């Protein structure tokens, strides 16, 4: 009955069933979800079955400087209004339910290659639109508690960069995915690591290192080489602004440790100006495109050393049998040189 009827919000709650057993424990349901809707906002308060014309709410009160009168909308006009209101509701529902296209990054159902846009402005006012953000990985961490048992806590890792040699990584933990994204983004923009680069597209020299049982070997490369490396390192290279190099990971595959060791190496790498200032010699580059011509790179800011370095013969140097194989050319593997994706 009308007395039995009641307001909308409690009906919506009882129909949607956001809480009570299903939502708790994370069991959820098998991809069934009732969409929220508001019927009062849709139709104007005036129309009904009997199409009385209301000068107060439905029709403008005055026309030609003459007060209006209550009148009847004929049944044909009533059917026209009903039809166009059906059309309007169908259009509203169409606009409501539609596709969602988050650009495919590393793969479907993965948060790897997606960017959340630049960081948010600071409280004092600091626009970071020059920065670009990327989500390295996402995981569902779980820890239990006394009374409620298993707690789910979304942990996320993100990186941010200019494209100008400046960038920063961070992680964010929170109960909500968007909240974790926001926290990690803020911490990344506030924790920044800068690294120099030789000619806008390369590291200064190849480096081999290890960090928590994660061996990394980055190799400088000439122009037009591309980025044939891990997908995460490719994304952060796009962030930094370097366009080509090579890299290999050996041992464990743990992207956070990978990134820590990688930024450590790219920070500890030495510039050629610093190298000349330290040694006391002129740096001299030679290319394969250019013939036997010494291109001076940098000179020591201090006084040049008079005696040059002695001839270093059969030096004690540790290297990698993998590189030995690749240089001698006997190595064979179908998986080494492939026509992989663009960069």
């Amino acid at each position: 009955s009308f007395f039995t009827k009641l307001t909308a919000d409690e009906l919506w709650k009882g129909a949607l069933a956001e809480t009570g057993a299903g939502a708790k424990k994370g069991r959820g349901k098998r991809t069934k979800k009732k969409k929220r809707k508001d019927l009062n906002r849709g139709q104007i308060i005036g129309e009904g079955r009997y199409g009385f014309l209301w000068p107060g709410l439905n029709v403008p009160l005055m026309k030609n400087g003459a007060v209006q009168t209550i009148a009847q909308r004929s049944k044909e006009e009533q059917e026209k209004v009903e039809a166009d209101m059906i059309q309007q509701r169908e259009e509203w529902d169409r606009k409501k339910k539609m596709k969602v296209k988050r650009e495919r990054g590393w793969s479907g159902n993965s948060w790897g290659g997606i960017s959340l846009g630049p960081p948010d402005p600071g409280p004092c006012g600091e626009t970071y639109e020059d920065f670009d953000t990327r989500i390295l990985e996402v995981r569902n961490v779980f820890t239990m508690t006394a009374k409620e048992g298993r707690k789910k806590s979304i942990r996320v890792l993100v990186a941010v960069g200019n494209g100008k040699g400046a960038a920063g990584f961070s992680i964010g933990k929170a109960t909500d995915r968007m909240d974790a994204f926001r926290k990690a983004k803020n911490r990344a923009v506030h924790h920044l690591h800068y690294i120099e680069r030789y000619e806008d597209h390369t590291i200064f020299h190849d480096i081999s290192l290890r960090f928590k049982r994660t061996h990394i070997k980055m190799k400088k490369q000439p122009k037009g080489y591309g980025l044939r490396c891990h997908r995460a390192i490719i994304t952060i290279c796009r962030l930094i602004g370097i366009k080509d190099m090579y890299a290999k990971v050996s041992g464990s595959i743990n992207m956070l440790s990978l990134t820590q060791g990688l930024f450590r190496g790219l920070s500890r790498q030495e510039t050629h100006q610093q190298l000349a200032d330290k040694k006391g010699l002129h740096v001299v580059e030679i290319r394969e495109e250019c013939g036997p011509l010494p291109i001076v790179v940098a000179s020591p800011r201090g006084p040049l050393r008079k005696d040059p370095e002695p001839e270093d013969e059969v030096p004690d140097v540790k290297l990698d049998w993998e590189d030995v194989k690749t240089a001698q050319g006997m190595k064979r593997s179908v998986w080494s040189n492939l026509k992989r994706a663009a960069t």
Partner: protein, 103 residues
């Protein structure tokens, strides 16, 4: 237009900008590394296939030897060697047509 002025036109700039044409295209394929041979062709019996390459989807473009600033977009300005079709994102037929046109 048969001439190459569609490139100088303004719709091309706003549609691409400074990046090359292949930079916008993306390949849908199996996991990890994509296949080593692209599709045979993007059009068949005057019918276009889903996920076409950019040079094939943009019918106003024309593979002609004379459209230089379009031809050298693929082959690197730093390295005279042309890029491979899995790199450029285009199918093998138009890629071979582009090779013969550039030569």
């Amino acid at each position: 237009d048969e001439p190459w002025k569609y490139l100088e036109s303004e719709e091309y700039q706003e549609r691409y900008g400074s990046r090359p044409v292949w930079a916008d295209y993306r390949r849908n394929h199996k996991g990890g590394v994509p296949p080593q041979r692209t599709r045979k062709t993007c059009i068949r019996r005057n019918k276009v296939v889903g996920n076409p390459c950019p040079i094939c989807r943009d019918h106003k473009l024309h593979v002609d030897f004379r459209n230089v600033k379009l031809l050298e977009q693929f082959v690197c300005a730093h390295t005279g060697i042309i890029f491979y079709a899995p790199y450029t994102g285009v199918c093998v037929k138009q890629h071979k047509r582009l090779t013969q046109a550039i030569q």
